[PDB]
């Protein structure tokens, strides 16, 4: 726990991905942010509110503009097991354009203090809706929606204008 | 205090739906009270051999169940209700089987049916089980030895126990 803001995300956590493929390997956060320009956005979770409606698409549609700015990878993370994140990623044909990761522990977001209680909505403790541009592990730009159901500042359009 | 042949009736509640705003939840009484219920739980939506060998058999024998007087056949899992639904739709299992969620895990925790599946990248989930409950009392209980096995919680078995 330590409010993300413009610091070094590098905390010994790790995230997931796949589609029920047996080995269960996971990706250390270093392999994701070290020596790379990363655009990453998180959301309440697969199959929820306005995630798979207004949040994800914009990133897929501007995948080129991102790479044009030198972005190494554009990733979507969510506190969902990697198998559901994938089912969902397939459903909205967002894979191949955006790298989807899971954070079933919620440990990734917990280390950045980006978890919020969405038990009223019938989802457990989840992540807030955010986006950030991280260079070699350092947060150059951070956007956290005031309300997880809003897509006012974590959209692709915004972060893009910040790189 | 694991489940065995007792009264499931514990003040918990389960879910369902498909991102429809009201967020109502179903009290366990409304589910088991005065009814013959066949219920089976599994590790979770989009996992191992759940949506492959476990669910189908129940859908395919939905008639035989009702023939025996079963009021409802339900599938429960520690997944939010929106994912359970996405999954239920995907495997065209709805309309045949009532799918519920247990995001709290509270339902299974009260029956001591939770197991740690962190190695498989799923959090704390439920074991793979099936049970026939009459007016809240467990007349038959089947808990797989290993959550990945479908040896005793299948539809075929529970059916032969009603």
Q: Which of A46, A49, A83 to mutate to test the interface with B (most CBs of B within 10 A)?
A: A83
Tell me the nearest-neighbour CA distance from A150 into chain B, angstroms: 15
Active site residue A51: yes
Backbone angles phi, psi at A38, to 5 degrees: -120, 135
Distance of CA A16 to the CA centre of its chain: 11
Please judge whether B23 and A120 are an interchain contact, meaning their C-beta atoms are less than 8 angstroms apart.
yes
Please judge whether B80 and A123 are an interchain contact, meaning their C-beta atoms are less than 8 angstroms apart.
yes
Tell me the nearest-neighbour CA distance from B84 into chain A, angstroms: 10
Nearest by Cα to A41 from A66, A13, A70: A66
**Both tokens of residue B38?**
């066949």
List the 73-92 stretch of B: residues with Cβ below 8 A of A. 79-83, 85-87, 90
C-alpha B55/C-alpha B87 separation (Å) is 11
Cβ–Cβ under 8 Å, residues A85 and A78: yes
Please judge whether B15 and A122 are an interchain contact, meaning their C-beta atoms are less than 8 angstroms apart.
yes
Q: Is B142 on the interface with A (CB under 8 A)?
A: no
Sole residue written with tokens 């790379």: A36
| Residue among A47, A81, A86 minimizing CB distance to B122 | A81
10 Å Cβ neighbour count for A19? 13
Sole residue written with tokens 């032969």: B160
Closest residue of chain B to A87, computed from CA coordinates: B46
C-alpha B124/C-alpha B107 separation (Å) is 13
Taking contacts as CB-CB distances below 8 angstroms, the residues of chain A near B147 are none
Q: Which residues contact B45 (CB under 8 A, 6 or more apart)?
A: A83, A84, A87, B51, B77, B79, B83, B84, B86, B87, B88
PDB experimental method: X-ray
Residue A110: in which H helix or E strand, if any? Answer: helix A107-112
Nearest by Cα to B62 from B50, B52, B74, B51: B74
DSSP states of B53-112 as a string?
IIHHHHHHTHHHHHHTT-SEEEEEESS-HHHHHHHHHHTT-TTTSEEEE-TT-HHHHHHT
Sole residue written with tokens 């006012």: A152
Sole residue written with tokens 């359970």: B84
C-alpha B107/C-alpha B55 separation (Å) is 20
Taking contacts as CB-CB distances below 8 angstroms, the residues of chain A near B15 are 122
C-alpha B135/C-alpha A13 separation (Å) is 46
Taking contacts as CB-CB distances below 8 angstroms, the residues of chain B near A25 are none
Catalytic residue among A43, A51, A76, A118: A51
The Cα-based distances of B105 to A18, B7, B14 in angstroms read: 24, 18, 9
List the 33-52 stretch of A: residues with Cβ below 8 A of B. 45-49
Rounded to 5°, angle at Cα A35 from A30 and A41:
65
Closest residue of chain B to A46, computed from CA coordinates: B83
Domains of chain B are 1-162 (3.40.30.10)
């Amino acid at each position: 726990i330590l409010s993300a803001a413009s610091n070094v995300s590098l905390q010994k956590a790790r995230t997931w991905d796949e589609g029920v493929e047996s080995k269960f390997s996971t990706t250390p956060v270093n392999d994701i942010f070290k020596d790379k320009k990363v655009v990453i956005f998180g959301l309440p979770g697969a199959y929820t509110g306005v995630c798979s409606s207004k949040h994800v698409p914009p990133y897929k549609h501007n995948i080129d503009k991102f790479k044009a700015k030198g972005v190494d990878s554009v990733i979507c993370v969510a506190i969902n097991d990697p198998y559901t994140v994938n089912a969902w990623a397939e459903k909205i044909q967002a894979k191949d354009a955006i790298e989807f990761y899971g954070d079933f522990d919620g440990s990734f977001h917990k280390s950045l203090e980006l978890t919020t209680d969405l038990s009223a909505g019938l989802l457990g403790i989840r992540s807030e809706r955010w986006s950030a541009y991280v260079v070699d592990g350092k947060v150059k730009a951070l956007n956290v929606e005031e309300s997880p159901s809003d897509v006012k500042v974590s959209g692709a359009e915004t972060i893009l204008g910040q790189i």
